[PDB]
Structure 1
Amino acid sequence: GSNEKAVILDEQAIRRALTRIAHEIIERNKGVDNCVLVGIKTRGIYLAKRLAERIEQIEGKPVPVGEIDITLYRDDLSVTSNDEPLVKGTDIPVDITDKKVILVDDVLYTGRTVRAGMDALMDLGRPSQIQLAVLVDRGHRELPIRADYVGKNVPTSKSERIVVQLDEVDQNDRVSIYEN
């Protein structure tokens, strides 16, 4: 059909949300001493790296960035969003024990990737807090998870999927919502 996709973050809205999140992290943590950013999912990781650069531009101190590499699966033959995270690997360049780790997710949906992210962190260390920054929160949580920082709330139905494009993997910055 026609009009079965819409842009929910254009490039400027992306850049503004990141900048907002950067400020929010700084205000809430009262600086970024002992903060570590950790990206989840391929685009969450690129977002995390943008976020750390933005925070560095604000504070003049680097923020370390790590990644948790997760692939999502389903237990059935349905075509519907994959909801089972499998953690493939981790790379965090610093110790996270007694640090505030900020998980960075492109789209908060079921919360299921976030939960695997939290456990993955707990396998590497004992942070004092795990916080969650997300570019989009589309609701329909399946676990009791919520974001500390949200670029945009986007109401959705379970039939819709959110497509995130970023320059680093997709050669354009855009978030879109699609029926089906």
Structure 2
Amino acid sequence: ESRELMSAADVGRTISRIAHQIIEKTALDDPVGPDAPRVVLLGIPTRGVTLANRLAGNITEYSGIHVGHGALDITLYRDSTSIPAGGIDDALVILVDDVLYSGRSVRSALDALRDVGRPRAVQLAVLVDRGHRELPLRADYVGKNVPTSRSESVHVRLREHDGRDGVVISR
């Protein structure tokens, strides 16, 4: 059994709001001072990459600033990577995924990240937080908090990846 949690319009509005939170919180709009570092969005393959790419698109549309974005493979970090020109050294890296659950993927991403470089800081953006974290990891940007039973599943859908925008829950 399945049900719609977010419509295509819902996801659009939320992704847009997330993009503006990012702009607000990083001030990427400003002349990048000493204490205001360049932003890089790295998505967790593969739908996380889709989300990071769209966020990058939105931010460019709203601010005129082109933020670097890529992908961070975590296959070899569980108990192809693509980094923008300029790397991540002393940058603000925003890890991006579609769903935050136990948090174990994000920890893998943190591990993977240090084989790449040394960011000034790392943030996390997700479309959905479905709870039941198993590590003290939290998203800095959350599209929607979706309370779930352990037996339920949350399914994020993005146009470029799955054919439609939407979020569905099933049991």
Measured in 2, the distance between the counterparts of 1:132 and 1:67 equals 14
69, 74, 98: which one aligns with 2:73: 69
Q: How many residues align?
A: 163
Q: 1:159 & 1:21 partners in 2: Cα distance?
A: 28
Superposed CA offset, 1:77-109 (max 9, x none): xxxxxxx848xx311123101000001110000
Does residue 52 in structure 1 map to residue 44 in structure 2?
no
RMSD across aligned positions (CA): 1.7
TM-score, normalised to structure 2, is: 0.90
User: Normalized per residue, which structure has more strand?
Assistant: 1
1:22-75 deviation digits (Å, cap 9, x = unpaired): 100111112255000000131110111100010001110101111023459xxx
**Which residue identity is paired with 1:112?**
R
Distance 2:73 2:4 in 1: 27
Query: Structure 2: which amino acid aligns with 1:64?
Result: G
Q: TM-score, normalised by structure 1?
A: 0.85
For 2:10 and 2:96, the matched residues in 1 are separated by 17
**Which string of whole-angstrom CA distances, capped at 9 and with x for unpartnered residues, describes residues 107-152 of structure 1?**
0001011011111111100000110000000110011100000000
Alignment of 1:92-107 (within 5 A): 92-94=83-85, 95-107=87-99
Conserved 8 A contact 2:53-2:69: yes
Instruction: Name the aligned partner's letter for residue 83 of structure 2.
Output: I
- Find the aligned partners of 2:157 and 2:10 in 1 and give their Cα distance: 13
Structure 1's unaligned 5+ residue stretches are 73-83
Between the aligned partners of 1:31 and 1:90, the Cα distance in structure 2 is 24
Matching residue of 1:77: none
Q: Secondary structure at the match of 2:81?
A: strand
Cα distance between partner residues in 2 of 1:111 and 1:41: 15
Q: How much identity, in percent, do the aligned residues show? A: 55
Instruction: Give the 5 Å matches for 1:21-60.
Output: 21-31=18-28, 33=32, 34-60=38-64
